[PDB]
Design an enzyme around this catalytic site. Structure first.
Site, mmCIF file in Angstrom:
data_model
loop_
_atom_site.group_PDB
_atom_site.id
_atom_site.type_symbol
_atom_site.label_atom_id
_atom_site.label_comp_id
_atom_site.label_asym_id
_atom_site.label_seq_id
_atom_site.Cartn_x
_atom_site.Cartn_y
_atom_site.Cartn_z
ATOM 1 C CG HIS A 34 -1.052 -1.437 1.691
ATOM 2 N ND1 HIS A 34 -1.156 -1.708 3.293
ATOM 3 C CD2 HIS A 34 -1.925 -2.254 0.967
ATOM 4 C CE1 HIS A 34 -1.540 -3.187 2.872
ATOM 5 N NE2 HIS A 34 -1.893 -3.573 1.674
ATOM 6 C CD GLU B 132 1.305 7.450 -1.425
ATOM 7 O OE1 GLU B 132 1.844 8.132 -0.581
ATOM 8 O OE2 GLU B 132 0.154 7.234 -1.533
ATOM 9 C CG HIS C 236 -11.134 4.108 5.428
ATOM 10 N ND1 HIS C 236 -10.136 5.234 5.141
ATOM 11 C CD2 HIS C 236 -10.666 3.121 4.142
ATOM 12 C CE1 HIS C 236 -8.729 4.658 4.352
ATOM 13 N NE2 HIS C 236 -9.983 3.372 3.491
ATOM 14 C CE1 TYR D 92 -8.981 7.979 1.718
ATOM 15 C CE2 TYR D 92 -10.170 8.186 4.181
ATOM 16 C CZ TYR D 92 -9.507 8.194 2.850
ATOM 17 O OH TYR D 92 -8.357 7.222 3.776
#
Ligand SMILES: *[C@@H]1O[C@H](CO)[C@@H](O)[C@H](O)[C@H]1NC(C)=O
Ligand SMILES: *[C@@H]1O[C@H](CO)[C@@H](O)[C@H](O)[C@H]1NC(C)=O
Ligand SMILES: *[C@@H]1O[C@H](CO)[C@@H](O)[C@H](O)[C@H]1NC(C)=O
Ligand SMILES: *[C@@H]1O[C@H](CO)[C@@H](O)[C@H](O)[C@H]1NC(C)=O
Ligand SMILES: *[C@H]1O[C@H](CO)[C@@H](O)[C@H](O)[C@H]1NC(C)=O
Ligand SMILES: *[C@H]1O[C@H](CO)[C@@H](O)[C@H](O)[C@H]1NC(C)=O
Ligand SMILES: *[C@H]1O[C@H](CO)[C@@H](O)[C@H](O)[C@H]1NC(C)=O
Ligand SMILES: *[C@H]1O[C@H](CO)[C@@H](O)[C@H](O)[C@H]1NC(C)=O
Lengths: 110, 593, 593, 110
Positions: free
Chosen positions: C324, C354, C484, C494
């Site tokens: 991940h 990222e 989550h 989100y």
């Protein structure tokens, strides 16, 4: 010798065509009975349709059944005579309805 | 003399004269289509002479009081003959109605839609019907649909308005409620012990036979819309009705046609023997002969020679005639078929359907002239269609050697075939009910002139689940674009037709000692059935139709279930698919915002 | 001494010790994934020592009354540090909540569905996810869906019930309304001039930012169902919700995935450069280097050497670690990414996403330790996702030389791409809103234990337009099957993430002086933007997020339109298709009678 | 002759790492100033990072800018002397923040 047209002349179409022929003259050489006077003869059944106009005729059949007596095809006769021989005449439209329009009565003596 | 007895010989002499003259009108009409030069226009004369004759004999059967008529047979003829009819009209009004009917018949007969190509036009025959049958271009089909309903539709409107006036005035004078009440009269019967039928008991027995047929229809309808969306993407909403010009013909009277789209198991070997025939060099003659042969086996007669000798079954195309398949009972033991036969499975079944007509005709031709007819409208039509069924089954095709016994007959081909049938049959039922539910309301004077079209489509969406693809204002007159509307035929017969049609096939296969699903049945070989059938055929319109049914079925009145039970395997399969589909429709959707 | 001044040096000495120990907990976690033998279990110790430290320092920041704190910066840190938190619980209840969280994290982490093959199991990773991603067998996908929500779902139920109890008791004690009220606290701000935000003003600004996003969603939803029916015939009704297990992943969190089915113009050359890369022999290193290079151009730093030297970006697979994709800001100028990179357009964009995180981390690493964070939850997530957008545009791909300028960029490829984006983005919005709308209602104590699942799916159907493929009784606990939820994260982030995410790209493209549709924009080369961005990045959680936004955008609060205007060309195209489709859904339909 | 390591040995990470180095000893051969007594010499600037544990070091750079006086690389000195020559020492983390951590003061005579 003596030949014999046994004629059934027919017309078609009364209140109902098909039910029965309109009219039908049955005749032994024109007249209504014939007695033979010259041993050996010849007899035939003629069937005569009078033009009507429709191809309905030709589906109208008049033939004679067998009936009362031994032989099947001495005097002959339209109309009834004691000790006769009814080859009865049957008239049919296309084998739907049958109706007997008369007979040929015969009388022997041997 | 007993006025019965006095009427007995009046009718005798009538039948005679009438059979002569009616052979004359019929022979001249045949000759219109059949033959050279000098045949084009004698039909129209000898028809008016027939008309003159019939008119006189009514004015003279008025002198025979029905009340004193004991013989049930003579009563009927007398009753039939003595109808004032159309003559009961102001001379001018009688002509003006005539004038109208011809105009409407001709505009439809000779109406054509054209293109900046005003010379190029297609007609209803080939032209458009061939488009509504094949074409898959929404816009093109819409153009065909709309152009026809506009060019030959708006023409018909003012005439059709006038047509209901006099047409009612004729009924209102004949002590009928309206011209609608008039047509229903056909199914009426009075004064026969517990065999009666009320003129308006038809409406109820249609409406109440319809609520029963409604469920099956919706599942068929909601099924097609789903398969249609797949052929016309974008265009079909699954809450709302189907767009008329997508139903496989100009009006959407049958869905038979556009089926290749709604086919269920298209994987299967196709049950169209159409080309199997060609491979065996079958001519138009080998069809009818194999159809005569069908009948012979069920205890009925082989065609009259002469039916053969002047019946036209091939098409001359070298001479030109009207190819709409017809069976002709002219007078005088004269029967023939006019049909422009092609080597087809379709034209094969049509042969059986038309010859069925001839067989009914030959059966009752002994009944007095006036009663030589189907027990009611659409008896005749049913007795022809009942033949297709037996003759369109695998069991039949298999044995007749047009399809090898090699043929795998699983539950797949089942629906495959049973669907096509429902497209044609369950297809038309609601179309038909509304068409007349409309005229009935018009002829009653319920819908006014300024809503005719609005109330028509309201009803199309409501009852039939179909939407106009374009808004139509009242300058239009769409029902008028259909044959049977502009050529002045009762249409509800096509409905009753179908209901009986099955009741028959049910009781008739019962006699043939059949076993499985009703649709597999093939009464051929089975004289047992043919006689049950003939026993009613030969009757003609001689006993009331309610009794005539009871001879073949067991009920004095029509019934819906025989039909439903024929479609049972299809019905419980369509629910299967409509488990998730939206089943039914909303009046409120339209393809035009 | 001014208690401000006394807290000033208290915080100095705290930040020193904290940066030491937080480097220790972070270095040990890296080492858990990163490296040999002796690294498997030190992470867990050195984290509890971090936990020990943080607890002491709260019990000691209670001695610094906030009211007397003038310096806005020290107030905030002090505020942050001095939260009684979980410690505020009966010793046993504090342990028992721990005991619960671990159990829940682990069951989900180590939950597997098996087959008369009790040895054979697949897990969530590869196993099922790879099925929900590719498989086109309704029954198989249903089996994956149901088996997971059963085996690792029913386990989670009793634990999750107990988890809301103590979890609330902890909030109720910390003078929050409920644990739900607690999470919302993240977006709170008090005592800053006309910059405040109420803890419950979030719900409204979500709900009221949702009614606005509802129309766009439905047209996307009613569009997919139509294309789905075509992939799963029989199964999807066009009145009713979509069957969860068809939505391309175990929960249907994004639809990105199952797209090849819902693709609009499949005719077009595919905009996946995935293989274009392979053809240029691009290694995992050439990706990140080309991403570093991206940032440099926007006025930001090239990565710290040492980020290079002990960042794991390839996957050892020879050693096993958690793949991940993650960005790590350990203490002490130390940044690295852990990502198991494949030569892909997807893994390409993920790099940008990222490294965006790393850039945010490097930007604020000067802020006092306690404030080194996203302004609020989901600022950080947004700042990464805003990079993908600029880097996944044709303009970018074109110039970067991964796609030749030869590429025809018509309105067709437009939707082609803009759709995929909406699958991913518009896709998750409603999913997300409901998921928290549910916990919110749970944590408030609105839904009782005996309706939890009933009220969940009611809401799935209602808000999200999705139905359970099987009935679930209350032994189930489906929200718990999501990461989550069981691993105890606020999820609403989100959502907010996405909203901001566009507001940025809007104002950031504004700065880049962009011209056309907002989705063609590619801020690279444009230092003008990068500085607008940095000006907020470096701030960390130092000013309130409401101000932090205003730096980049112009509003004190989130806004919906930037997003909507990004999707304008898709929105007006989806209505085009849903001119006839059924747009919306009914709660009442279910795939199980 | 006389050589001269001018050393700046630095550690890292106070209340904030990256803000400024933690500590930095500046040194002229160990002690705080050096006066040259043997004409010709050699002078060098050595920079010494003390291991801290993170690859954060190495992104920490301490170099000396130019400044007060003509030459760029007689006595030397940590600490202020009248009439000097501040080559000031600047310390930076990754070229983000700059912070001057001292100087080398020089004093000529010609
Ligand atoms: C009606 O008239 C015809 C004449 O032959 C006869 O066959 C029929 O039996 C009559 N019916 C009655 C009821 O008298
Ligand atoms: C009836 O039909 C079958 C095949 O259909 C045939 O083999 C049989 O001989 C037929 N018999 C009669 C008497 O019509
Ligand atoms: C808070 O403290 C730091 C110490 O350097 C200072 O930079 C900042 O200006 C102070 N803020 C206020 C408002 O006094
Ligand atoms: C920016 O990018 C373009 C192509 O994307 C490139 O040709 C140009 O030289 C770049 N310039 C700078 C300064 O980054
Ligand atoms: C019948 O015989 C007569 C003589 O009796 C003859 O003149 C006539 O031609 C014959 N008719 C037929 C049809 O044979
Ligand atoms: C009987 O009379 C008529 C004359 O009118 C004739 O047709 C028929 O031939 C006669 N028969 C004989 C045998 O002379
Ligand atoms: C610096 O010089 C000293 C002598 O003054 C010597 O011992 C040492 O090795 C040198 N260090 C470096 C790093 O050059
Ligand atoms: C200055 O003092 C210390 C002794 O502790 C030493 O490190 C350094 O080398 C000395 N310098 C000289 C030039 O002797």
């Amino acid at each position: 010798h003596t030949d014999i047209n046994f004629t059934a002349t027919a017309s078609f179409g009364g209140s109902c065509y098909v039910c029965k022929p309109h009219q039908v003259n049955i005749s032994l050489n024109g007249n209504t009975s014939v007695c033979v006077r010259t041993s050996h003869f010849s007899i035939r059944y003629i069937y005569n349709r009078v033009k009507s106009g429709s191809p309905g005729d030709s589906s109208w059949h008049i033939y004679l059944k067998s009936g009362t007596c031994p032989f099947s095809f001495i005097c002959f006769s339209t109309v009834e005579v004691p000790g006769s021989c009814n080859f009865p005449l049957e008239a049919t439209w296309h084998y739907t309805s049958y109706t007997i329009v008369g007979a040929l009565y015969v009388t022997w003596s041997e | 003399s007993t006025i019965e007895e006095q009427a007995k010989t009046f009718l005798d002499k009538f039948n005679h004269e009438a059979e002569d003259l009616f052979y004359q009108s019929s022979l001249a009409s045949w000759n219109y289509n059949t033959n050279t030069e000098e045949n084009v226009q004698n039909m129209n004369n000898a028809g008016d002479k027939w008309s003159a004759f019939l008119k006189e004999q009514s004015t003279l059967a008025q002198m025979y009081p029905l009340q004193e008529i004991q013989n049930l047979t003579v009563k009927l003829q007398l009753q039939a003959l003595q109808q004032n009819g159309s003559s009961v009209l102001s001379e001018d009004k009688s002509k003006r109605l005539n004038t109208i009917l011809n105009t409407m018949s001709t505009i439809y007969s000779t109406g054509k839609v054209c293109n900046d190509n005003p010379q190029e036009c297609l007609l209803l025959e080939p032209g458009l019907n061939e488009i509504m049958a094949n074409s898959l271009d929404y816009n093109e089909r819409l153009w065909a649909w709309e152009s026809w309903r506009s060019e030959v539709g708006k023409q018909l409107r003012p005439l059709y308005e006038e047509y209901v006036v006099l047409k009612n005035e004729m009924a209102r004078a004949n002590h009928y409620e309206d011209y609608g009440d008039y047509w229903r009269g056909d199914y009426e019967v009075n004064g026969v012990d517990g065999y009666d039928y009320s003129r308006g008991q038809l409406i109820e027995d249609v409406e109440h036979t319809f609520e029963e047929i409604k469920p099956l229809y919706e599942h068929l309808h909601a099924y097609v819309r789903a398969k249609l969306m797949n052929a016309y993407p974008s265009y079909i909403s699954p809450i709302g009705c189907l767009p008329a010009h997508l139903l496989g013909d100009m009006w959407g009277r049958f869905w038979t046609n556009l089926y290749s789209l709604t086919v269920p198991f298209g994987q299967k070997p196709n049950i169209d023997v159409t080309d199997a025939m060609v491979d065996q060099a079958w001519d138009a003659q080998r069809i009818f002969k194999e159809a005569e042969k069908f009948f012979v086996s069920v205890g009925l007669p082989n065609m009259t020679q002469g039916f053969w000798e002047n019946s036209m079954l091939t098409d001359p195309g070298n001479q030109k005639a009207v190819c709409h398949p017809t069976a002709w009972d002219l007078g005088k033991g004269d029967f023939r078929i006019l049909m422009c036969t092609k080597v087809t499975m379709d034209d094969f079944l049509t042969a059986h359907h038309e010859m069925g007509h001839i067989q009914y005709d030959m059966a009752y031709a002994a009944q007095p002239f006036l009663l030589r007819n189907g027990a009611n409208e659409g008896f005749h039509e049913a007795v022809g269609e009942i033949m297709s069924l037996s003759a369109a089954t695998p069991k039949h095709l298999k044995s007749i050697g047009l399809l090898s016994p090699d043929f795998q007959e699983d539950n797949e081909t089942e629906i495959n075939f049973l669907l096509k049938q429902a497209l044609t049959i369950v297809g038309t039922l609601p179309f038909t009910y509304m068409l007349e539910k409309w005229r009935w309301m018009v002829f009653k004077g319920e819908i006014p002139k300024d809503q005719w079209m609005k109330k028509w489509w309201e009803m199309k969406r409501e009852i039939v689940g179909v939407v106009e693809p374009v808004p139509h204002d009242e300058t239009y007159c769409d029902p008028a674009s259909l044959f049977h509307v502009s050529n002045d035929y009762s249409f509800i017969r096509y409905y009753t037709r179908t209901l009986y049609q099955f009741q028959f096939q049910e009781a008739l296969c019962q006699a043939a000692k059949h076993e499985g699903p009703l649709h597999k049945c093939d009464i051929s070989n089975s004289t047992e059935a043919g006689q049950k059938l003939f026993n009613m055929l030969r009757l003609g319109k001689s006993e009331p139709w309610t009794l005539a049914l009871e001879n073949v079925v067991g009920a004095k009145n029509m019934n819906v279930r025989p039909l439903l039970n024929y479609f049972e395997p299809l019905f419980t399969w369509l629910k299967d698919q409509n488990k998730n589909s939206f089943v039914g429709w909303s009046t409120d959707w339209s393809p035009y915002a």
